[PDB]
């Protein structure tokens, strides 16, 4: 049992746990794979920072536990490569 996430990375940075089937792994534009659920909180809500005008963040760039900064969300949660997970179970 395990996941072949080695292709892109392995486990999610936010939780630091292997990518399980229900983990729904996703690759960010910063080149960091993480659990989709973990990726949710990654984006800001009702808040912004370093915004020249209007509003910054939330639907656009996402904060990553690695770089904690993004320019665009073109490669953000949406380009899920696949589920390298397989035969994953709590029991042995
Ligand atoms: Zn995670
Ligand atoms: Zn990152």
UniProtKB/Swiss-Prot annotation:
Q: Write out the tissue specificity statement of the associated record.
A: Expressed in all tissues tested including spleen, thymus, prostate, testis, ovary, small intestine, colon and peripheral blood leukocytes.
- Can you locate the Glycyl lysine isopeptide (Lys-Gly) (interchain with G-Cter in SUMO2) cross-link? 74
Quote the annotated effect of residue 15 to A: Reduces nuclear localization activity of ZNF268
Zinc finger regions (RING-type), where? 12-68
* Domain statement: The HP1 box is both necessary and sufficient for HP1 binding.
UniProt subunit comment: Interacts with SETX. Oligomer; the RBCC domain homotrimerizes and interacts with one molecule of KRAB to form the KRAB-KAP1 corepressor complex. Binding to a KRAB domain is an absolute requirement for silencing gene expression. Interacts with CEBPB and NR3C1. Interacts with a number of KRAB-ZFP proteins including ZNF10, ZFP53, ZFP68, ZNF382 and ZNF256. Interacts with NCOR1, NR3C1 and CHD3. Interacts with CEBPB (via the RING-type and PHD-type zinc fingers). Component of a ternary complex that includes TRIM28, a HP1 protein (CBX1, CBX3 OR CBX5), a KRAB domain-containing protein, and DNA. (Microbial infection) Interacts with herpes virus 8 protein LANA1; this interaction facilitates establishment of viral latency.
The record's comment on protein family reads:
Belongs to the TRIM/RBCC family.
Protein's name according to its UniProt entry: Transcription intermediary factor 1-beta
**What gene does the UniProt entry assign to this protein?**
TRIM28
């Amino acid at each position: 049992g395990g996941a072949e996430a080695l292709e892109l990375l392995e486990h999610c940075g936010v939780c630091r746990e292997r990518l399980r089937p229900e983990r729904e792994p996703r690759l960010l534009p910063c080149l960091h794979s993480a659990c989709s659920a973990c990726l949710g909180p990654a984006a800001p809500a009702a808040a912004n920072s370093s915004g020249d005008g209007g509003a910054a963040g939330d639907g656009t760039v996402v904060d990553c536990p690695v770089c904690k900064q993004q320019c665009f969300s073109k490669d953000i949660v949406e380009n899920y490569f696949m589920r390298d997970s397989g035969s994953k179970a709590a029991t042995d």
